[PDB]
Design a protein around this ligand. Structure first.
Ligand SMILES: [Mg+2]
Ligand SMILES: [Mg+2]
Ligand SMILES: [Mg+2]
Ligand SMILES: [Mg+2]
Ligand SMILES: [Mg+2]
Ligand SMILES: [Mg+2]
Ligand SMILES: [Mg+2]
Ligand SMILES: [Mg+2]
Ligand SMILES: [Mg+2]
Lengths: 295, 295, 295, 295
């Protein structure tokens, strides 16, 4: 299994565009997907956290997945977010996404209900048992309120269909050892730690700021891969203001406001997420100009 | 607004009983509701966290609410959990619960997606606007990954339908000041802090261990309310092993295993929650014997 | 052993007054000690955290202890802070304080170096063996970077000289069980949790805000003791602004600036602690007016 | 100012050897210093955290510094740990260390007392003003209970003697931006993050596991410096078991037990730190064999 070829190296956790009435806008979704791949992404995650998976319906997730596969599926990998805090629901979503032709699944730690580690294991195993797709665990305790503990990640690595981890936990030392011991592929799921994750052996990024700076993140991956760490560091510093704006706004608000500033209107977030205020737009524009992604 | 009369003073966040095949068991739900009210609860919350709100459908929640209202609605207050991380969904569920005849709503902080405080305010206001029912905010950052900050609670207090807070944040000092300044009623949402919350002015408990020890928690409330803090303290120590077991197991696993030990089978949890192991059952039984609610 | 009589019920963790040249001001220490006892304290802790134990010498600690014993030792209990992160030093200081006539010892968890629990346990028992004085553990992981875990506290309880705990860890449920199981006396070491700790069985307070509001805290203890929880709650709200100021400033800065505002100059802190800025004094005076301890 | 030449690139935060009766063992300190430099360290920190700075006297620290300077000062850089939670004491120690011929100073964030940021700034400025030596800030909030906030680091960067940071805070993103903006040199102060810190631009390591594996850490620095990240990553994995053992034991217990296993007896720790148990020695020996530093 060639993870870089099968899932990608630079993915955006793409926003889900909404029309002015809040409804799903698949035409803009196809335009945005083409834009992000043209800028350097070789894969996309649809209905990740940044895609507002909490506020879209099953039917909207499937419509979006279909539109993005049609738009870019012949030249980029399209990974479907399919996990929730409900194992039966997650299985239904995984099967539906496989039926549409998703290239892989991203499955987040069940949030809010804080299952024990053996419940996390049974959950992820049940989802991995539901389809033949390659599956990435998505470890984000800062959102889900429980981590996937290292012993649990290691147990899940023995599943033939679980191929890697999108990490937003930042235990770089543990991830390095898991990668060495199990061959799971790691993706950085926190843009601030993209470069440290590459140092520890990560395959690539599942990025939020790639909405705005995909070309530079592609240059960073290439520079690092060729051993030119000084250039990778310089690019990382160049895009650092975008990580700073992400910390202020969150990925959903940042991505929808930033794309608008770049001339790609993707609508507003759905409640309880909120659109950036005029003052926040002004501060975001300043960071984007500093990062050379806005005139 | 007489919160103690309209919502209760001892509520159980009732489990949702499932049959052996995992389906909803409304017959057992009615039997359990009657048991908990006969043992001392003057209200019940249906489809709270402990009721496995993540893994039940809208239709199951409504069918359960109807069954519990028909069983105990003439002699106890029935509060419906109606909040998720999706504002549009939360509004639909609140309206459906009001149409069934719920006496009040429990609305948790949107989990996982980490909206900003102004998004929380818009979310809670939208849900509070949706029906004429009294509403409790449910502040549990250890599950939802964001708190309701005190400025946000104070802003929401002026909504005519928002009457109180189920607190699982444990900021007793902040809650005391909010109670004093706004008149919001507070309920303890963490059995470990039941007695500290009463000292600070809380109206009562929305309890997990009341599944097993409702009679003693009623005595605790009566002892504290009569001025016999020493006896309230002794009762709190008596039921402390149940709080310890809840820390080990979580409320869902604890409540379903403990009720089975007491002879009221309510089925097992739905994944990703899990039934207690044999070792956990033995340790739980020991705590229940220590708390005089078994054998 | 009568802890309330031997150690007290309302203690101030007294500041150490410094003269204009920075030296120890024992005349002001005696004046302050008399003031705090006259206002309602029945004991004092000298060279606690609030007494700037980090920046005073052993000789200054002994001179302060001597001055306070002379001033109030016949009508109040004087407890000496004697613990550091160095077991040999802690033993030396404990012996010197006992030789001066201290009535008891306060011994903080070794800070910074993060010993394992068995090292903490060896440390505390070695200090407890050094003198025949009664000793309080001081559990403050937010400062020392490690807690005294409950199994460790329970093991230390069987030492005859270890009679209680000054708690700044806020695990009210664990402390309640430890008091019931072991008979250790608890003192609130966090003013915001004074009333919760009383509800769980604490003997009293080792207080910072008693520098400014000792009379009201004595009234709180009396009201709680007589079962007038409504009055205790009302006093607790009345002094809450002082707790808020303490959260902004820390105890050392708050106590020295607040005493100065009340007309009792005790000098300024030693670096790295700092005196309140002009705007901090303005904000502190507002909280003191709200708490009725400043005109 | 050539930080790599003036302070080094691979430093050990060297243990302080004690004799059987616990007294300072300067002959063994000189022997250990020569060993660590021969193995690849080009500098040493004496009386850091791992050097048991909490439990040694000023006189012992100066005797140790004198002995280590005599042993290796002509061919390695000898940095003196000079910071405590007492600014006046820290200044005395810094001046005494400069008088002995130390090549630089390592100054930890004042621990336990939680000064505000302006107090930290005044503290570090006062210590930096006390000598002509180059000085490293040591940011370790997990031990000291307060961080050096980025604004504070940036303010201190302007001091001519403050030349860099030993980081154990792990905010790699902030450290990268600080290095870019100020030119401060960063050293990894947590072996688990050595490789990520190099990726972000760190100058080298102030290491604990270098007591046992200095040769491999030197190879790691050399491979990374030459752009051979794959080899650096493989060496980092090879020594990862030592980082795991550090997490279980702490640096003081690990280093003294591991050196003894290698045939370099440096005595035992001073209370409250403790010597490894037989079971801990067995588990440590397994990790050392895995890392190829024990037969
Ligand atoms: Mg939904
Ligand atoms: Mg659902
Ligand atoms: Mg209305
Ligand atoms: Mg209201
Ligand atoms: Mg000293
Ligand atoms: Mg004795
Ligand atoms: Mg004892
Ligand atoms: Mg000392
Ligand atoms: Mg400088």
């Amino acid at each position: 299994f060639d993870v870089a070829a099968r899932l990608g190296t630079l993915l955006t956790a793409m926003v889900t565009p909404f029309s002015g009435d809040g409804s799903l806008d698949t035409a803009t979704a196809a335009r945005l997907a083409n834009h992000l791949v043209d800028q350097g992404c070789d894969g996309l995650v649809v209905s990740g956290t940044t895609g507002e998976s909490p506020t879209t319906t099953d039917g909207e997730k499937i419509e979006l997945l279909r539109a993005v596969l049609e738009a870019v599926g012949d030249r980029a990998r399209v990974i479907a977010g399919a996990g929730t805090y409900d194992t039966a629901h997650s299985i239904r979503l995984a099967k539906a996404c496989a039926a549409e032709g998703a290239h892989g699944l991203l499955v987040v730690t069940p949030y809010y209900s804080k299952p024990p580690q053996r419940g996390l294991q049974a959950h992820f195993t049940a989802v991995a048992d539901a389809t033949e797709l390659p599956m990435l665990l998505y470890d984000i305790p800062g959102r889900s309120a429980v981590p996937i503990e290292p012993d649990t990640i290691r147990a899940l690595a023995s599943h033939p269909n679980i191929v890697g981890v999108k990490d937003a936990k930042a235990d770089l030392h543990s991830g390095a050892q898991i990668m060495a011991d199990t061959g799971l592929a790691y993706y950085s799921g926190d843009d601030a730690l993209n470069l440290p994750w590459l140092a520890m052996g990560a395959t690539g990024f599942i990025s939020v700021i790639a909405h705005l700076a995909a070309g530079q993140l592609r240059e960073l991956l290439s520079a690092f891969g060729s051993g030119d760490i000084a250039t990778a560091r310089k690019i990382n510093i160049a895009v650092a203001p975008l990580c700073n704006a992400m910390s202020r706004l969150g990925g959903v608000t940042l991505s929808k406001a930033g794309l608008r500033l770049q001339g790609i209107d993707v609508g507003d977030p759905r409640l309880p997420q909120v659109a950036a205020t005029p003052e926040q737009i002004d501060a975001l524009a300043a960071d984007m100009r500093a990062a050379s992604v806005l005139r």
